[PDB]
């Protein structure tokens, strides 16, 4: 018996990978998961997280 | 497992037997010092109707 | 510690007894109650009579037959007051009740053999010296039992046949007691004396 303060098993809410099956785009990701986990640079973390965004979050710059 | 049960054809080692007496005699000479100890030993054990091993003493 | 615990009934108090006798059955111990008409009950006579009369009017409406049978025989009374104290509807309960045997007086088998007593149930080890108790045989007779006399007659016979046995045993105990008196003071008797005997 535990009085949960928070809603149990929150699925985080953020993306863990691109919902696409774009083989090449999935390569960049495997390339960046690495960079964002070894280089330590804040840059890769943002770029990596940025590949998982849908076409409505990757506006045409 | 092919004879089962066709007696012994394997009993004892004459050695083990002699080694008994080699010691038996030694203790036997020790038992005839304490009265009834030979009888107490040639006697088996058993619990009686109204024998309590916890409130007992050995 | 014996295969059958023949239990004397005189003095005992129904409930109290009924309970221990009931636990001894549901433990495997076989039991046989004797002199169930010398069995006592708490409260005065008139109360235990009304209580039987308030149970005597409890029968099935549409058929007084399939109704709660009201046994008047002291053995069956004490028994009905022991049934409710066992899960008699299950096989285990049906089984424990086949280890029990409640007799009026003391029949032929359970008379040549020693009967014991249960202190935790006995009247003169409970009832505060002064409170009015009740004898079963007395009540039963006043509610349908028709063999009050027959027993008083038989036990009277057995009590004299038994009193004669004990008189022989009275002198036979004193007999061996007198041989044990002179056997003492001897070198083998004083050997055990120090060995706690």
């Amino acid at each position: 018996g535990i009085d949960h303060t928070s809603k149990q098993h929150k699925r985080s809410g953020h993306r863990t990978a691109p919902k696409s099956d774009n083989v090449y785009l999935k390569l960049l990701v495997k390339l960046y998961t690495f960079l964002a986990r070894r280089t330590d640079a804040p840059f890769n973390k943002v770029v990596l997280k940025a590949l998982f965004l849908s076409k409505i979050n990757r506006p045409p710059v | 497992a092919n004879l089962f049960p066709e007696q012994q054809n394997k009993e004892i080692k004459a050695e083990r037997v002699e080694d008994q007496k080699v010691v038996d005699k030694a203790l036997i000479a020790e038992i005839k010092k304490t009265p009834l100890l030979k009888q107490y030993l040639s006697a088996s054990f058993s619990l009686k109707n109204g024998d309590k091993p916890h409130m007992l003493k050995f | 510690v014996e295969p059958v615990v023949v239990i004397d009934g005189k003095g005992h108090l129904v409930g109290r007894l009924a309970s221990v006798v009931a636990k001894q059955l549901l433990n495997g111990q076989k039991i046989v109650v004797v002199r169930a008409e010398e069995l006592n009950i708490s409260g005065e006579f008139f109360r235990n009579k009304l209580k039987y009369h308030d149970f005597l009017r409890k029968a099935t409406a549409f058929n007084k037959t399939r109704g709660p049978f009201h046994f008047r025989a002291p053995s069956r009374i004490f028994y009905k007051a022991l049934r409710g104290m066992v899960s008699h509807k299950t096989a285990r309960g049906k089984a424990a009740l086949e280890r029990l045997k409640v007799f009026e007086g003391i029949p032929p088998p359970y008379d040549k053999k020693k009967r014991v007593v249960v202190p935790q149930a006995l009247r003169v080890l409970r009832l505060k010296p002064g409170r009015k108790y009740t004898t079963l045989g007395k009540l039963s007779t006043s509610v349908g039992w028709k063999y009050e006399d027959v027993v008083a007659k038989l036990e009277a016979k057995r009590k004299v046949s038994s009193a004669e046995y004990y008189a022989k045993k009275r002198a036979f105990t004193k007999k061996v007691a007198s041989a044990n008196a002179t056997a003492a003071e001897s070198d083998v008797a004083k050997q055990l004396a120090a060995l706690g005997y």
Partner: protein, 106 residues
């Protein structure tokens, strides 16, 4: 000479239970003579064995066995909880069982 009991007469009472839920995983035995939790302690561990007779003969006997072991005191009247390789039958509530004196501490 006439007696050869190297164990004690225990009676399998009922399984550990409540008012309406018995847990067969544990039994309750009323050992002969024992009546206190202090003097009950001397029976703990003592491998228990319920001996019964079967009709069909197995490896060589018509009398199979159920092994157990006292696990702890229980209550205030010298009763003890026992467990077996295979829990007891239930058809054995009021069945004389055997409490050996091993593993012996004395």
């Amino acid at each position: 000479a006439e007696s050869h009991r190297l164990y004690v007469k225990g009676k399998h009472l009922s399984y550990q239970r409540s008012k309406r839920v018995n847990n067969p995983n544990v039994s309750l035995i009323k050992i002969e003579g024992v009546a206190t939790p202090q003097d009950a302690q001397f029976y703990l561990g003592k491998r228990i064995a319920y001996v019964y007779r079967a009709s069909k003969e197995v490896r060589g006997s018509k009398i199979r066995v159920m092994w157990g072991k006292v696990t702890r005191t229980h209550g205030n009247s010298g009763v003890v909880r026992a467990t077996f390789r295979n829990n007891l039958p239930a058809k054995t509530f009021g069945a004389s069982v055997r409490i050996f004196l091993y593993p012996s501490n004395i």
